Amino acid sequence: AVKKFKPYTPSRRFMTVADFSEITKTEPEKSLVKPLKKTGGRNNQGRITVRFRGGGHKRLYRIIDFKRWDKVGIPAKVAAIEYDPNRSARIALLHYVDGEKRYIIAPDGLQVGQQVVAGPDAPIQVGNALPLRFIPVGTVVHAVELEPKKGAKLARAAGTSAQIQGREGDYVILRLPSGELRKVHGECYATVGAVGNADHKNIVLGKAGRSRWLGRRPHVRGAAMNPVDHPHGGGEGRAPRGRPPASPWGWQTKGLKTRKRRKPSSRFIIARRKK
Amino acid sequence: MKRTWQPNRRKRAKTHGFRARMRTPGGRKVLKRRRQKGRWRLTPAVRK
RNA sequence: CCGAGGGUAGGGCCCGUGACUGGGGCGAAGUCGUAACAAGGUAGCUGUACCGGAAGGUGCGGCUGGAU
RNA sequence: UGGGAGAGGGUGGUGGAAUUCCCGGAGUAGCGGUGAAAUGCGCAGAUACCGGGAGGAACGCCGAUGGCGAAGGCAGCCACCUGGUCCACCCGUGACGCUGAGGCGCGAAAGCGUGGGGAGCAAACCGGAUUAGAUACCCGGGUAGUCCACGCCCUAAACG
RNA sequence: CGAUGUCGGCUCGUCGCAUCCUGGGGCUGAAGAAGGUCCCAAGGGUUGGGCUGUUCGCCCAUUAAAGCGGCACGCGAGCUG
RNA sequence: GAAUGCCGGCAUGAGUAACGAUAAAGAGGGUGAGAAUCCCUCUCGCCGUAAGCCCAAGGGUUCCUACGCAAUGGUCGUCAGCGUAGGGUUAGGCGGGACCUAAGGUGAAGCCGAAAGGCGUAGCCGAAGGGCAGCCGGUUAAUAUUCCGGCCCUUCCCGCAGGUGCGAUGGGGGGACGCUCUAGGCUAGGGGGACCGGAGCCAUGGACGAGCCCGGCCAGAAGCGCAGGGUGGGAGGUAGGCAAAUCCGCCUCCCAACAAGCUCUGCGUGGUGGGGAAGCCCGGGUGACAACCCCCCGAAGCCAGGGAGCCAAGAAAAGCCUCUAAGCACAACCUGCGGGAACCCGUACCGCAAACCGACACAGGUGGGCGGGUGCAAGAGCACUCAGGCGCGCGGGAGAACCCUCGCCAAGGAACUCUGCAAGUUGGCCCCGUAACUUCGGGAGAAGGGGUGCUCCCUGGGGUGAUGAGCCCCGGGGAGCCGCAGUGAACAGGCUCUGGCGACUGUUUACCAAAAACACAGCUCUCUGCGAACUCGUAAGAGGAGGUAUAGGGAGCGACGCUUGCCCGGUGCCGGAAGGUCAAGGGGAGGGGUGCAAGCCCCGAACCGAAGCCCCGGUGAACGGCGGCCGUAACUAUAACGGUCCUAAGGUAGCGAAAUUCCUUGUCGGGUAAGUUCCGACCUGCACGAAAAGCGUAACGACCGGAGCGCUGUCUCGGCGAGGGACCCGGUGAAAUUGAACUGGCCGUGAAGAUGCGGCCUACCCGUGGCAGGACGAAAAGACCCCGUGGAGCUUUACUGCAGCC
RNA sequence: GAGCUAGCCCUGGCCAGGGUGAAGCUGGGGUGAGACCCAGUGGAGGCCCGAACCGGUGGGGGAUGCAAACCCCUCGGAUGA
Ligand SMILES: CCC[C@H]1[C@H](O)[C@@H](N)[C@@H](O[C@H]2[C@H](O[C@@H]3O[C@H](CO)[C@@H](O[C@H]4O[C@@H](CN)[C@@H](O)[C@H](O)[C@H]4N)[C@H]3O)[C@@H](O)[C@H](N)C[C@@H]2N)O[C@@H]1CO
Ligand SMILES: [Mg+2]
Ligand SMILES: [Mg+2]
Ligand SMILES: [Mg+2]
Ligand SMILES: [Mg+2]
Ligand SMILES: [Mg+2]
Ligand SMILES: [Mg+2]
Ligand SMILES: [Mg+2]
Ligand SMILES: [Mg+2]
Ligand SMILES: [Mg+2]
Ligand SMILES: [Mg+2]
Ligand SMILES: [Mg+2]
Ligand SMILES: [Mg+2]
Ligand SMILES: [Mg+2]
Ligand SMILES: [Mg+2]
Ligand SMILES: [Mg+2]
Ligand SMILES: [Mg+2]
Ligand SMILES: [Mg+2]
Ligand SMILES: [Mg+2]
Ligand SMILES: [Mg+2]
Ligand SMILES: [Mg+2]
Ligand SMILES: [Mg+2]
Ligand SMILES: [Mg+2]
Ligand SMILES: [Mg+2]
Ligand SMILES: [Mg+2]
Ligand SMILES: [Mg+2]
Ligand SMILES: [Mg+2]
Ligand SMILES: [Mg+2]
Ligand SMILES: [Mg+2]
Ligand SMILES: [Mg+2]
Ligand SMILES: [Mg+2]
Ligand SMILES: [Mg+2]
Ligand SMILES: [Mg+2]
Ligand SMILES: [Mg+2]
Ligand SMILES: [Mg+2]
Ligand SMILES: [Mg+2]
Ligand SMILES: [Mg+2]
Ligand SMILES: [Mg+2]
Ligand SMILES: [Mg+2]
Ligand SMILES: [Mg+2]
Ligand SMILES: [Mg+2]
Ligand SMILES: [Mg+2]
Ligand SMILES: [Mg+2]
Ligand SMILES: [Mg+2]
Ligand SMILES: [Mg+2]
Ligand SMILES: [Mg+2]
Ligand SMILES: [Mg+2]
Ligand SMILES: [Mg+2]
Ligand SMILES: [Mg+2]
Ligand SMILES: [Mg+2]
Ligand SMILES: [Mg+2]
Ligand SMILES: [Mg+2]
Ligand SMILES: [Mg+2]
Ligand SMILES: [Mg+2]
Ligand SMILES: [Mg+2]
Ligand SMILES: [Mg+2]
Ligand SMILES: [Mg+2]
Ligand SMILES: [Mg+2]
Ligand SMILES: [Mg+2]
Ligand SMILES: [Mg+2]
Ligand SMILES: [Mg+2]
Ligand SMILES: [Mg+2]
Ligand SMILES: [Mg+2]
Ligand SMILES: [Mg+2]
Ligand SMILES: [Mg+2]
Ligand SMILES: [Mg+2]
Ligand SMILES: [Mg+2]
Ligand SMILES: [Mg+2]
Ligand SMILES: [Mg+2]
Ligand SMILES: [Mg+2]
Ligand SMILES: [Mg+2]
Ligand SMILES: [Mg+2]
Ligand SMILES: [Mg+2]
Ligand SMILES: [Mg+2]
Ligand SMILES: [Mg+2]
Ligand SMILES: [Mg+2]
Ligand SMILES: [Mg+2]
Ligand SMILES: [Mg+2]
Ligand SMILES: [Mg+2]
Ligand SMILES: [Mg+2]
Ligand SMILES: [Mg+2]
Ligand SMILES: [Mg+2]
Ligand SMILES: [Mg+2]
Ligand SMILES: [Mg+2]
Ligand SMILES: [Mg+2]
Ligand SMILES: [Mg+2]
Ligand SMILES: [Mg+2]
Ligand SMILES: [Mg+2]
Ligand SMILES: [Mg+2]
Ligand SMILES: [Mg+2]
Ligand SMILES: [Mg+2]
Ligand SMILES: [Mg+2]
Ligand SMILES: [Mg+2]
Ligand SMILES: [Mg+2]
Ligand SMILES: [Mg+2]
Ligand SMILES: [Mg+2]
Ligand SMILES: [Mg+2]
Ligand SMILES: [Mg+2]
Ligand SMILES: [Mg+2]
Ligand SMILES: [Mg+2]
Ligand SMILES: [Mg+2]
Ligand SMILES: [Mg+2]
Ligand SMILES: [Mg+2]
Ligand SMILES: [Mg+2]
Ligand SMILES: [Mg+2]
Ligand SMILES: [Mg+2]
Ligand SMILES: [Mg+2]
Ligand SMILES: [Mg+2]
Ligand SMILES: [Mg+2]
Ligand SMILES: [Mg+2]
Ligand SMILES: [Mg+2]
Ligand SMILES: [Mg+2]
Ligand SMILES: [Mg+2]
Ligand SMILES: [Mg+2]
Ligand SMILES: [Mg+2]
Ligand SMILES: [Mg+2]
Ligand SMILES: [Mg+2]
Ligand SMILES: [Mg+2]
Ligand SMILES: [Mg+2]
Ligand SMILES: [Mg+2]
Ligand SMILES: [Mg+2]
Ligand SMILES: [Mg+2]
Ligand SMILES: [Mg+2]
Ligand SMILES: [Mg+2]
Ligand SMILES: [Mg+2]
Ligand SMILES: [Mg+2]
Ligand SMILES: [Mg+2]
Ligand SMILES: [Mg+2]
Ligand SMILES: [Mg+2]
Ligand SMILES: [Mg+2]
Ligand SMILES: [Mg+2]
Ligand SMILES: [Mg+2]
Ligand SMILES: [Mg+2]
Ligand SMILES: [Mg+2]
Ligand SMILES: [Mg+2]
Ligand SMILES: [Mg+2]
Ligand SMILES: [Mg+2]
Ligand SMILES: [Mg+2]
Ligand SMILES: [Mg+2]
Ligand SMILES: [Mg+2]
Ligand SMILES: [Mg+2]
Ligand SMILES: [Mg+2]
Ligand SMILES: [Mg+2]
Ligand SMILES: [Mg+2]
Ligand SMILES: [Mg+2]
Ligand SMILES: [Mg+2]
Ligand SMILES: [Mg+2]
Ligand SMILES: [Mg+2]
Ligand SMILES: [Mg+2]
Ligand SMILES: [Mg+2]
Ligand SMILES: [Mg+2]
Ligand SMILES: [Mg+2]
Ligand SMILES: [Mg+2]
Ligand SMILES: [Mg+2]
Ligand SMILES: [Mg+2]
Ligand SMILES: [Mg+2]
Ligand SMILES: [Mg+2]
Ligand SMILES: [Mg+2]
Ligand SMILES: [Mg+2]
Ligand SMILES: [Mg+2]
Ligand SMILES: [Mg+2]
Ligand SMILES: [Mg+2]
Ligand SMILES: [Mg+2]
Ligand SMILES: [Mg+2]
Ligand SMILES: [Mg+2]
Ligand SMILES: [Mg+2]
Ligand SMILES: [Mg+2]
Ligand SMILES: [Mg+2]
Ligand SMILES: [Mg+2]
Ligand SMILES: [Mg+2]
Ligand SMILES: [Mg+2]
Ligand SMILES: [Mg+2]
Ligand SMILES: [Mg+2]
Ligand SMILES: [Mg+2]
Ligand SMILES: [Mg+2]
Ligand SMILES: [Mg+2]
Ligand SMILES: [Mg+2]
Ligand SMILES: [Mg+2]
Ligand SMILES: [Mg+2]
Ligand SMILES: [Mg+2]
Ligand SMILES: [Mg+2]
Ligand SMILES: [Mg+2]
Ligand SMILES: [Mg+2]
Ligand SMILES: [Mg+2]
Ligand SMILES: [Mg+2]
Ligand SMILES: [Mg+2]
Ligand SMILES: [Mg+2]
Ligand SMILES: [Mg+2]
Ligand SMILES: [Mg+2]
Ligand SMILES: [Mg+2]
Ligand SMILES: [Mg+2]
Ligand SMILES: [Mg+2]
Ligand SMILES: [Mg+2]
Ligand SMILES: [Mg+2]
Ligand SMILES: [Mg+2]
Ligand SMILES: [Mg+2]
Ligand SMILES: [Mg+2]
Ligand SMILES: [Mg+2]
Ligand SMILES: [Mg+2]
Ligand SMILES: [Mg+2]
Ligand SMILES: [Mg+2]
Ligand SMILES: [Mg+2]
Ligand SMILES: [Mg+2]
Ligand SMILES: [Mg+2]
Ligand SMILES: [Mg+2]
Ligand SMILES: [Mg+2]
Ligand SMILES: [Mg+2]
Ligand SMILES: [Mg+2]
Ligand SMILES: [Mg+2]
Ligand SMILES: [Mg+2]
Ligand SMILES: [Mg+2]
Ligand SMILES: [Mg+2]
Ligand SMILES: [Mg+2]
Ligand SMILES: [Mg+2]
Ligand SMILES: [Mg+2]
Ligand SMILES: [Mg+2]
Ligand SMILES: [Mg+2]
Ligand SMILES: [Mg+2]
Ligand SMILES: [Mg+2]
Ligand SMILES: [Mg+2]
Ligand SMILES: [Mg+2]
Ligand SMILES: [Mg+2]
Ligand SMILES: [Mg+2]
Ligand SMILES: [Mg+2]
Ligand SMILES: [Mg+2]
Ligand SMILES: [Mg+2]
Ligand SMILES: [Mg+2]
Ligand SMILES: [Mg+2]
Ligand SMILES: [Mg+2]
Ligand SMILES: [Mg+2]
Ligand SMILES: [Mg+2]
Ligand SMILES: [Mg+2]
Ligand SMILES: [Mg+2]
Ligand SMILES: [Mg+2]
Ligand SMILES: [Mg+2]
Ligand SMILES: [Mg+2]
Ligand SMILES: [Mg+2]
Ligand SMILES: [Mg+2]
Ligand SMILES: [Mg+2]
């Protein structure tokens, strides 16, 4: 896990790469890939609305199955585990015993050639999906719908998970990957097990070039700009921020909470995030 | 060095052409004004 | 051909020396405190960590070479 | 060969007590702390009481002058994996032994790297005291760390 | 202010004399030698370097001496920058 | 009569600068009124990874021929891309369209917006991407994969025969894919031949030779041959591929498996069709029944959708194949053969340039392919040269100063200078050898040296072929020869020690700054639970993201190492259901106006009443801040120590005369003969200091310092030489500027710096080459400065408002 | 008005030749098994020389220019941001 390199270039001594040892197939299922339109951070008006984006490697988008309740009771074999460049997690190729082929994000521990299934009567096993109400209290879980039949929304990234803390009426209590305590409907589906590829955070990009490969263009500090461009612009020589540190758009960027106060989901957020 | 005029027939007709003008209000008012001024030609000549 | 050596170039070892800087030994009666020897007035010693004008203090574990 | 004792080690799981916190209830004028106090906490409803929930660390009684380990060291309980040792029978090998410069491995605490974890405790730091002073002992706070995994550190009143 | 280019250097000189040297002098607390001071005198001469943008200044090695000033702090339609 | 007025005309500078790469010219013979300039020949130089050839843009008759020379052409002109006229561009296969999709554009549906309009699924458009059928040669003054010749092929229609469950905008397969490295076999291309064909040639001392010179092929249908690519067979089940499905997917079983078979390409051969040199003679004729053979090298191209590895994970749709739906099975589809049908547009010429973009026939700019040979290690580098193309559209002289580009230099050798600026030196390859330090890779081309040609002899292996010869590729040893010198010409690091800044590769002020600046991996803080936060938009809608806290936004800091202390009093931000203030609204004690009165109408206290602010806490890798005075030790000196005032707290580690130090060239040491710079120290740090990070740091740097070595024209201190200019002659012929000018020096005066006034001195009239002191020379209505109640960018706890948010 | 310039999207193209020799793989040594070491193979890299190409460091020229940014000598990078 995490391959290092000898320092034979300046950049190599810090660059690290994934071990890729869990991957078993190196080309995607043609039936489940579709072209991925690179935006470069521009919208239908043409304007950059997310700065510092563009120019990374071309990608194909693997269609992933965030529902899984559309095939209740139909077991599937884990055919392969594959690379997905659209996400931090690895994906698992499923061959359903009724013929259909799908991708799911690969939980940790999932091995090729094993049965998985979804439904209220499913066993509590790494890779199975159930409504949250049918999962024992205290089990880690991932790919969690935030509302019934609306799609898996929570605990998607590599290594993430969500622990079930308790039950209350139609609602179970989840500890999200951020540490927030939240109520999620018991009818929402979830997949027992944490998402795999936990060493994804120990990867060291080693040089600027790798960031460019990922479609990340160089970020330029407000302190480097001019007053026309940024609150931190200007100064003779260097200059401390000389005001509360602000975004390019004036609003303060140290501690200022921005969650909408009257947002209706607040009635279901038990505790804001930790740390 | 590389100068500002780099002719390109597709570009010329797609940018200043008759069909480009008629598509927007400002383009139609150009044509109205040029037609009123008596301009022999309302749009750049590009041989296509 | 070899050849004393001369020469150019780059290494190794040792000795002397250097603005300044580090502590050390030693030197009857200078200054600050009082850490240790009595339970030495916070039992002491301890490896380490961090701190403090200075002896020292404190955490963590260890020893009795600790009184009662 | 057949037995026996044991906190010997490693892995996964797990059980209750207590502390802190959070939510609900009930209740009101103080609580806390000391040699005595103050800082601090409390009518913005604390402390004391009940129910609930979260989380970490440590395992009371048994417990001992006890047991095991080469040493460091090892204590809730369950299971897996594994080390050492003792005894009986007197069956096998037939001196195959003792030690051990180098080597290699192990090695309390503290400390270090990358992640995680964080209740309690607590270097540093802050405050209240004491005091001539108090960079201390006492008190209220309190961050590393204390905990887990992996990788280094290799020291000790590592002592009989 | 419908523009008189601003330091220093380089190059090229030219002038003044309140003279650094060389020539002539008087006084000397001028024995000699060598000095001090003042007078006359502008003919000629008045070095090579280290440092600094430097002018100046300090220092090295010399020297008969290593003079002081003016010429838009001489000289950028001559150069340097 | 003046407006740096406006329009025009004509002057001045002036026969002046220049006439656009220094690749280069000369003579003869032509034509003509006229010739350095046009034509022809011979000689000379120049490009030759082009300065040659073929495409694509863009240009649009500039192409060909005839007739011209007014203007255009930097001179000339008989010439021309100029003027006039006539001619010239031929395709089912090349390119595009009647085929397909990409971004994007458009857009029935739907959504949104005062209007105009903005979105938007399908669908439509959109190509240098996918798909699709022509190759060799001949012919014209000018077109040719287009005309013609030879050999091939595609689609549509109809027919005939055979076969089959046929049938699609519907399902599926396929199309269909990255980067780096890469195998086998070929081909393009090239090298060689003592073999084959050829008009000849023997010089000038030798050669009648295994002599010189020239050439030795291109295309090709079926078949065959070599080399590859693609591809399991069959059956049973089947809930999935939005109806069906015999297909596809999933499952089971049987047999084949590195073959084979089928299928498709490439290369070879291939019936036949072409081509065919030098030389000689007038583009052609001959050569010539031309020959058309062997060997070697060999692609980056072909087989290809091959193989391997790697992470950053690598379009779509149609053609095509298959499956079935309605339907239809007299049909329809497939297969084979035959006849018939096959439209629109481009096609000239230029295309690294005199035809494109730069006002010019402009030393600049412009995408793709081919780009021969020899040698130098290789190569597209460099020198020469082939095919081919040019001698750059002013020339002839002269042989000054001076300028440019270049060569050399006695002795010295950085003494030059802000600075070794510049120019030397070094320089490729092989081998020997190589330091501190280091993150263990590096530093390293360290530094420093040796070798390098040619001949003869002996020999090792490789490729091809066959194992041999031959060619060809890497070497090894020994003896020699020559020169001043052997990468003999061309192309080809000067080196070292020590600081500063930044880790680094990168990036930037197009046109004065390439850096220490920006970026950067990495660290931290912070926001964000997803209809996310944030961004653009009135909105719809997008982006974020078809992502989900190991994620996405914002901010500082900026690899790595060791680290980042104290202050929450002020500002920000975060938390706080109490309290205080607080708007509309609720409330209506209590008044008022009016009317005869019911009534109508107006004012209006208490009290209830958000956010915000007050208030209570928190918070620094939030904005920020991190003291003063006096005294004291048994010599002096200095204060471990104490006293006191203030604060929210009084700067911790580490650094320090520094990219920071005013006094300052601080002081001491080092280096030097001498050192305001440099390096090392010290510490009264005017005014370092810890993520506007602090102290280090190997490696890196066209960054900025200091030193040394090497070597020099930088210098003492200049000299000579070359060429292109300057100069003279012929041709063409500008420019800024210009009140008019008959335009001297001194000392004065004058608005204070006089050719122009005074006095004096000096001076015959006009040029040409030179130098720049003056004409307060030219240029720009000073860019500094002030002034204007002139303007603009920027800031903020200036005013006021608006978005946004509450 | 993005036919210049800037960023992004889509689809194509280009980058001679020569150096260095990462991981892995193999064999060998080592050990209880390991780590590990040696050789070979291998061919990594915002690696090195150097064109084409992209630039524009220093100097000189040019300055009514060949050119409203050029010429010469030199120089940065050149499988990648
Ligand atoms: C004439 C010389 C007299 C001297 C004495 O000989 C010295 N020993 C010294 O004496 C000091 C003495 O100074 C100590 O004596 C030692 C120097 O000589 C040193 O103390 C240290 O001694 C070390 C051993 N040489 C260690 O034990 C440790 O570092 C100290 N204890 C000094 O700090 C001090 O402690 C006493 N309070 C006062 C006393 N007069 O200084 C004196 C000067 O006046
Ligand atoms: Mg690494
Ligand atoms: Mg390493
Ligand atoms: Mg993996
Ligand atoms: Mg698809
Ligand atoms: Mg997208
Ligand atoms: Mg759009
Ligand atoms: Mg943005
Ligand atoms: Mg962007
Ligand atoms: Mg993801
Ligand atoms: Mg993945
Ligand atoms: Mg829910
Ligand atoms: Mg990381
Ligand atoms: Mg990417
Ligand atoms: Mg980043
Ligand atoms: Mg940045
Ligand atoms: Mg700035
Ligand atoms: Mg700026
Ligand atoms: Mg702007
Ligand atoms: Mg602003
Ligand atoms: Mg600012
Ligand atoms: Mg600034
Ligand atoms: Mg500043
Ligand atoms: Mg700045
Ligand atoms: Mg400030
Ligand atoms: Mg602000
Ligand atoms: Mg906001
Ligand atoms: Mg939360
Ligand atoms: Mg340009
Ligand atoms: Mg263009
Ligand atoms: Mg076009
Ligand atoms: Mg266009
Ligand atoms: Mg148009
Ligand atoms: Mg017109
Ligand atoms: Mg008309
Ligand atoms: Mg128009
Ligand atoms: Mg000798
Ligand atoms: Mg005393
Ligand atoms: Mg004494
Ligand atoms: Mg003690
Ligand atoms: Mg004591
Ligand atoms: Mg005491
Ligand atoms: Mg004590
Ligand atoms: Mg302490
Ligand atoms: Mg109270
Ligand atoms: Mg907890
Ligand atoms: Mg026996
Ligand atoms: Mg703790
Ligand atoms: Mg106190
Ligand atoms: Mg240990
Ligand atoms: Mg003025
Ligand atoms: Mg004027
Ligand atoms: Mg002027
Ligand atoms: Mg005397
Ligand atoms: Mg006298
Ligand atoms: Mg004189
Ligand atoms: Mg001075
Ligand atoms: Mg003077
Ligand atoms: Mg002046
Ligand atoms: Mg003056
Ligand atoms: Mg002055
Ligand atoms: Mg000048
Ligand atoms: Mg000057
Ligand atoms: Mg002048
Ligand atoms: Mg001059
Ligand atoms: Mg008048
Ligand atoms: Mg006039
Ligand atoms: Mg006017
Ligand atoms: Mg006018
Ligand atoms: Mg006019
Ligand atoms: Mg006029
Ligand atoms: Mg007229
Ligand atoms: Mg005229
Ligand atoms: Mg006249
Ligand atoms: Mg004239
Ligand atoms: Mg003349
Ligand atoms: Mg003249
Ligand atoms: Mg001229
Ligand atoms: Mg000219
Ligand atoms: Mg000219
Ligand atoms: Mg030239
Ligand atoms: Mg030349
Ligand atoms: Mg001749
Ligand atoms: Mg001639
Ligand atoms: Mg004639
Ligand atoms: Mg002529
Ligand atoms: Mg003539
Ligand atoms: Mg001719
Ligand atoms: Mg002749
Ligand atoms: Mg050639
Ligand atoms: Mg085009
Ligand atoms: Mg034209
Ligand atoms: Mg004419
Ligand atoms: Mg004429
Ligand atoms: Mg004529
Ligand atoms: Mg005529
Ligand atoms: Mg003309
Ligand atoms: Mg011309
Ligand atoms: Mg044809
Ligand atoms: Mg038709
Ligand atoms: Mg309209
Ligand atoms: Mg189309
Ligand atoms: Mg096409
Ligand atoms: Mg075609
Ligand atoms: Mg053909
Ligand atoms: Mg069918
Ligand atoms: Mg179809
Ligand atoms: Mg594909
Ligand atoms: Mg694909
Ligand atoms: Mg393709
Ligand atoms: Mg890649
Ligand atoms: Mg061929
Ligand atoms: Mg060859
Ligand atoms: Mg079925
Ligand atoms: Mg014949
Ligand atoms: Mg190629
Ligand atoms: Mg291919
Ligand atoms: Mg492949
Ligand atoms: Mg599509
Ligand atoms: Mg029928
Ligand atoms: Mg069929
Ligand atoms: Mg038609
Ligand atoms: Mg044609
Ligand atoms: Mg060119
Ligand atoms: Mg031409
Ligand atoms: Mg133009
Ligand atoms: Mg121009
Ligand atoms: Mg010309
Ligand atoms: Mg050839
Ligand atoms: Mg070579
Ligand atoms: Mg060349
Ligand atoms: Mg010429
Ligand atoms: Mg002459
Ligand atoms: Mg000579
Ligand atoms: Mg010389
Ligand atoms: Mg020297
Ligand atoms: Mg020398
Ligand atoms: Mg020097
Ligand atoms: Mg000089
Ligand atoms: Mg050379
Ligand atoms: Mg060394
Ligand atoms: Mg070394
Ligand atoms: Mg170093
Ligand atoms: Mg090393
Ligand atoms: Mg060397
Ligand atoms: Mg030799
Ligand atoms: Mg020779
Ligand atoms: Mg070099
Ligand atoms: Mg060095
Ligand atoms: Mg920088
Ligand atoms: Mg840099
Ligand atoms: Mg730095
Ligand atoms: Mg660094
Ligand atoms: Mg950095
Ligand atoms: Mg680079
Ligand atoms: Mg610039
Ligand atoms: Mg500029
Ligand atoms: Mg500009
Ligand atoms: Mg420049
Ligand atoms: Mg640079
Ligand atoms: Mg920048
Ligand atoms: Mg950096
Ligand atoms: Mg860092
Ligand atoms: Mg963090
Ligand atoms: Mg907005
Ligand atoms: Mg999306
Ligand atoms: Mg920064
Ligand atoms: Mg270090
Ligand atoms: Mg504060
Ligand atoms: Mg506070
Ligand atoms: Mg505060
Ligand atoms: Mg209350
Ligand atoms: Mg309020
Ligand atoms: Mg402030
Ligand atoms: Mg403050
Ligand atoms: Mg500290
Ligand atoms: Mg200092
Ligand atoms: Mg100083
Ligand atoms: Mg100094
Ligand atoms: Mg410093
Ligand atoms: Mg300072
Ligand atoms: Mg100074
Ligand atoms: Mg000094
Ligand atoms: Mg001092
Ligand atoms: Mg700051
Ligand atoms: Mg700061
Ligand atoms: Mg650099
Ligand atoms: Mg640089
Ligand atoms: Mg030097
Ligand atoms: Mg000279
Ligand atoms: Mg000459
Ligand atoms: Mg004459
Ligand atoms: Mg003459
Ligand atoms: Mg004339
Ligand atoms: Mg003329
Ligand atoms: Mg007049
Ligand atoms: Mg007159
Ligand atoms: Mg006169
Ligand atoms: Mg006056
Ligand atoms: Mg006067
Ligand atoms: Mg006069
Ligand atoms: Mg007058
Ligand atoms: Mg008068
Ligand atoms: Mg007069
Ligand atoms: Mg006179
Ligand atoms: Mg004349
Ligand atoms: Mg003249
Ligand atoms: Mg003059
Ligand atoms: Mg003048
Ligand atoms: Mg004037
Ligand atoms: Mg004037
Ligand atoms: Mg003048
Ligand atoms: Mg003047
Ligand atoms: Mg001007
Ligand atoms: Mg004006
Ligand atoms: Mg004005
Ligand atoms: Mg003015
Ligand atoms: Mg002006
Ligand atoms: Mg002023
Ligand atoms: Mg005013
Ligand atoms: Mg006024
Ligand atoms: Mg104003
Ligand atoms: Mg404006
Ligand atoms: Mg304004
Ligand atoms: Mg408004
Ligand atoms: Mg453009
Ligand atoms: Mg491409
Ligand atoms: Mg390349
Ligand atoms: Mg190797
Ligand atoms: Mg391998
Ligand atoms: Mg590279
Ligand atoms: Mg190299
Ligand atoms: Mg390089
Ligand atoms: Mg230079
Ligand atoms: Mg000039
Ligand atoms: Mg210029
Ligand atoms: Mg140039
Ligand atoms: Mg060059
Ligand atoms: Mg390359």
For strand G, which residues in window 8-27 of chain A come within 7 Å by CB?
8-12, 15
**CA A54 to ligand 108 centroid distance, Å:** 25
**Closest ligand (CA of A36):** 6
**PDB experimental method:** X-ray
Within A193-273, strands assigned E span 269-271
CA distance A125 to A109: 10
**CA A9 to ligand 3 centroid distance, Å:** 12
Judge whether A88 and A197 are in contact, CB under 8 Å: yes
Q: Which residue has the tokens 């931190």?
A: A232
Q: Which residue has the tokens 């259909």?
A: A100
Q: What residues contact residue A217 under an 8 Å CB cut-off, 6+ apart? A: A52, A53, A54, A55
Residue type, A213: W
**CA A170 to ligand 15 centroid distance, Å:** 41
**CA A9 to ligand 83 centroid distance, Å:** 66
CA distance A159 to A196: 5
Strand order in the sheet with A115-116: A101-105, A91-96, A76-82, A115-116
The answer to whether some atom of strand G lies closer than 7 Å to the beta carbon of A42 is yes
Strand order in the sheet with A171-175: A129-131, A189-192, A140-142, A162-168, A171-175, A181-185, A269-271
CA distance A30 to A138: 39
CA distance A122 to A195: 19
**Closest ligand (CA of A218):** 16
Nearest CA to A174 out of A268, A70, A85 is that of A268
Which nucleotide C1' is nearest A27 CA? F313
Helix, strand or coil for residue A165? strand
Judge whether A92 and A80 are in contact, CB under 8 Å: yes
Judge whether A76 and A117 are in contact, CB under 8 Å: yes
What is each CA distance from A234 to A229, A238, A239, A242, A247, in whole angstroms? 9, 9, 8, 11, 15
Closest residue (CA to C1') to nucleotide F178 in the complex: A58
CA distance A38 to A254: 32
Within A97-222, strands assigned E span 101-105, 115-116, 129-131, 140-142, 144-145, 152-154, 162-168, 171-175, 181-185, 189-192
For strand G, which residues in window 57-116 of chain A come within 7 Å by CB?
58
CA distance A93 to A79: 5
Residue type, A40: G
- Which long-range contacts does A11-17 make (Cβ < 8 Å, 24+ apart)? A11/A206, A11/A207, A11/A209, A12/A206, A13/A206, A14/A204, A14/A206, A14/A207, A15/A204, A15/A205, A15/A206, A15/A207, A15/A210, A16/A202, A16/A203, A16/A204, A16/A206, A17/A203
Q: What tokens were used for A60?
A: 């194909």
CA distance A239 to A233: 9
The answer to whether some atom of strand F lies closer than 7 Å to the beta carbon of A185 is no
CA distance A271 to B1: 65
CA distance A92 to A110: 9
Percentages helix, strand, coil for chain B (3-state, rounded to 5) are 55, 0, 45
- For A130-163, letters b (16+ CB in 10 Å) and e give bbbebbeeeebbbbbbbeeeeebebbbbbbbbbb
Q: What tokens were used for A264?
A: 């209706």
